[model samples]
Target: DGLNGTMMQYYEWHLENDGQHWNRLHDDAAALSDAGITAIWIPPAYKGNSQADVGYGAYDLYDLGEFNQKGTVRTKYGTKAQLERAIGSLKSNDINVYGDVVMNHKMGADFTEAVQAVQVNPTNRWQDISGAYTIDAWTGFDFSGRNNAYSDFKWRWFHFNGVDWDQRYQENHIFRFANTNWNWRVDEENGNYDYLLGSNIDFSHPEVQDELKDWGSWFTDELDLDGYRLDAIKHIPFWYTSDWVRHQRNEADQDLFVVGEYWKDDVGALEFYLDEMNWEMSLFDVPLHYNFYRASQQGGSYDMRNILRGSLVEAHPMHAVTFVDNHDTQPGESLESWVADWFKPLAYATILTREGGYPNVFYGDYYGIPNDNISAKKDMIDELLDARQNYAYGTQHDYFDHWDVVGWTREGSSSRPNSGLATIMSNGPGGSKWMYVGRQNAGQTWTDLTGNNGASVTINGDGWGEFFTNGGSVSVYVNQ
Candidate 1:
């Protein structure tokens, strides 16, 4: 079923407007389902620092745009009612909904408290830069608006291990609280990446773990979610995330598909994290996205054969969620690595038509980021989605001989009639390749589903055929 599943990230960094996304998505659910989007990763539905917080700076996990907090009653997406309606619509269309979970940090504290802290190196959190001193840290969260509707859990300075800013000293530095240390088994970046941004939660604390588990149970049941998109897992303790996922899955009584944002380009790090967690969750293929970024910028000089080099999808397909670009990679963002527009079709084809990895379509790419001058690739993506759902099945063959012209084929499946595909692409001057289509599809006529070449290829008796592609473009030939 992995081959038949396709995911769509439903939000971008910059969206049309606030208080409208949920209704808009509700209207588009049928169309997205028809286009073969089996699941949707919605934005953080909780109230953030403000109406425009983009859901990353989480304020109230219990307030699903219901409580009047942080200057607005509704979240950036919409009110709680709209969000519930949208989820209902998506589920009615037979699409799974995934909620974004930001458990590593908290923002918009109700009050600040003076605590004993020591400054640490921002780059390397393990190295202490200064002696212990009293500083005012934003560690008080009372959630007065909700007034203990779902839970009356209040966070204090002891609940968090570190803070990036101190109000008393009027300074900005990584400050580790007195008698607290970074949680073990976190990302080894900069010695220890346990402290990322905002108030880093101390997973070692028993109360913190209990509150989080309770919240997870309440959130899952409240939203009727299919899975979770965990944010900033590198900063959180690995064991805690693994345990949290298990608890939620057990509570839901279903295999909740959890994906964490590790945000590392090294396959070894990803593999090591997966092993550490005992393969309990999947991760975004950050290396594959970087490869696509490099290839898009390099153009003809780039070696297409090495496109998948160092990619998790190649080695760990089941745990890889392949994507071209995401909100962080969009224009004007911190991790801005937008793939060139000219190469998007090639990048999408690589992920969509391939047998490995669960492909995820970026929201900006499918819906168009007009504010950033990025046009939507909906038409091209639709073709690929259709191919994946209807024709991309059975045994596969790869032809990576040429540096520019690479091709692959899928033998027609017995279950899916005319479910064979031949995909050829070029980053340089285009040409034709004589590839095997399988004896089962012999004498059958196949046309370029993408219409990039507008030419049809007929399979010979021995299952060999010549497929053509336009220069710097791709062509997917499926049964006409």
Candidate 2:
């Protein structure tokens, strides 16, 4: 990994359900490699509740659109053959593929079982709202379509700790098993967020843990995946996460990269999970994403100087996978925090040029959310991607002293020609910042690659020059 490593979330939340996404990824693999994307984080590649399901609503883990389960033989993406071909195309171009696997919950059970469960307070899962009552819980997953092709393991109510829908009453409520206890290690958001949705897996159950481990090894080996993106880990037990990642790396027999989606704005909460995880896996820089969201919302009122403050990248750079807006943050999604269009360039510049976390570009931003007609920032992001590859290298110098505008520089390294750049951005009124690129680059003619600014400034004899940015925009200046 000599070059700068960058990831791309290759699927949008609102993709068409025509079962052509895997083919699309296969067709665009070369173009993505040309765009400097080293890793691709694909959507869940399993059978969901139905054909249109996004794969998060896990119906069958082993069925990657192969088995005739869940009322379809093809996932929202495509058939199993298509997914493998797409991954092959990506790997052929030296791009690593990371699968987004869901483990905390299971959905679309094939049948229901009459079991005794207690209704828990929705706000606090620990508080039982009612005594144990017999309810028909949809906790059975036979995966009959698979017909025990991979493993004969069948899911039952005992395998899970809780379920949201009790068919007996035809009501949706937080119901926990009478004999089970909520996992002690989980987000304290809803006073114990062990149960997120669907049938919650009991990580404490030895069989459940072993089966999941068996599935993990099978998934990595079967798909030949290079990494994994753990979905909704905030609801999962941290110790399980730690052991599972270790097991994956051990099974893969390589330092397989793994990142988790904790989804907490608090940097402390993010780091606390990392600490408990023993830093076995990196986490999405949730605080940094919130920073971008706030900057886009507040505009001039937000202080640009504190943009990097209280971010996971600032503290745990090695364990922070930075992203601006992803599928969940898109418009109309449950976690809609779409960054305003005006601030996207500035946000991308910050994540791409900084010497911190591994940056991930969103597919919706790169290709545009067709459903909403959101304009694509492909041209702008491509320029930043180029800068990230060639110029954003070596040591970094920060000029984060101003409230409205901030700039940074990368001193050119000895090994790379034209390897230095100055990134100037503003959340308010545009201005120039005097920054140093390096005396080695003195007298170098520099121009804006983004083309937002039409002016060029010669690097003074001391290697310091005034770089300008437009109001509420960013300009990346590199050697001409």
Candidate 3:
């Protein structure tokens, strides 16, 4: 299924504000529906802790009531009722909703709040640990007064070890030691850095498991969510997460879907986790995303075959979610800025019209400066969304990539064997541009989607033209 043009945050904002602005968001929603967009991914609707934006640091699981500044349901986003209304409105139009869920940690007022809340030692009062736990420094809880064994290890030995946490230099927040070389070690027998922002709720704990299941069930049944996107999955242990997936899926019934953000780039490594979870799809197509950035920017080659050749394709290829830009890509440091406007649409064309998996388009406001061209961008994305629903483009295809261009062709259906599009995008010295065959005509005539003053030409055998250019990006489509 292809996503509608707008991403979740904008949709949420639009829904909350009732489509205030130059264009009513409801109009965009209607246009996407008319264009046959089938699905939309929304952000976390859960209550978050202090200072956490984008709804990732969850505070309470059961509080789905109105959002208030001091209440458990509070957040910058709209209240629960507003979110529900948005979901209902979109679903009524036959669009599926994928809800994002953060399961890694709970929200607290601060690291101190987290430390105070977790019950570390229930039986032995002498071993009780509270207050912020720091790996680089003693939290006054090392009862044994023993030297840390992790002192000898280098920063590379730990995950995110050299990074700053909680604005404290060399002070670890959640994963690594503050200034020390220590990894997140949960097991006491071998842990050198056993401190957590809060006591990491042991998923192995029966109560924690029940709480997670209960939370998941509430979201599925009460919220009417069709699918879930798990966040920070790699941070959670494998066995615990595998069981977590099974429980959530079973509770939501077979029709419910689940996708995880493993954040790993290696297909082999990611596959191991996937195999263990017994699920299909991952948001960790690091290789493809990297190549997409290159082709969209930096004047890399634009042949789908070469791009696809480097990627790992599973038996069930549709399990991965592909995209060009996302929340974490950094401002103005993304393929979106490098590629032509047509390049984004063309990328969607390849993802939705070609094959293997679902396509996701990022539709969020840039944090630094709002992207004023969102409306224009959506105009092009709407077309690709239409192609996905109507022609099933991404289902049957092959790809090509070379030094100068990357292109791919989707084998047309029996009714329209030569009806698919051929796209080539380049980020070479001259900038990027693209072209495509008109869906209406079969005669060798093709129109430039970009209409950059290039006269439409007739193809003697196959059709071809340029869409636009920005640092050398180009794409061409064939109606077959």
For residue 135, model 3's alpha carbon misses the true position, in angstroms, by 11
Q: Give the Å shift of residue 43 in candidate 3.
A: 0.8
Across residues 393-465, which tens digit of lDDT does each residue of candidate 1 receive?
8898999889999989989688888899999999999988989879989998999889899777999999988
Native-referenced Cα lDDT, model 2: 0.91
Q: At residue 364, give the lDDT of candidate 1.
A: 96
lDDT of each: 0.91, 0.91, 0.47
Assess the local accuracy of residue 438 in candidate 3 as a C-alpha lDDT between 0 and 100. 36
Provide backbone clash counts, one per model.
0, 0, 60
**TM agreement with the true structure for every prediction:** 0.98, 0.99, 0.68
Candidate 2 RMSD to the correct structure:
0.9
Worst 10 residues of 1 by lDDT: 1-10
Candidate 3 off by > 4 Å: 1-28, 65-74, 109-199, 295-297, 300-306, 309-316, 332-346, 365-376, 391-401, 414-419, 429-444, 450-471, 476-480
Name the TM-score of candidate 3: 0.68
> How would you encode candidate 3's per-residue C-alpha lDDT over 248-291 as one tens digit per residue?
77777547566676654466656666777766545545456555
The 10-residue segment of model 2 with minimum total lDDT is 246-255
**Could you report the Cα RMSD, in angstroms, for every candidate shown?**
1.1, 0.9, 10.3
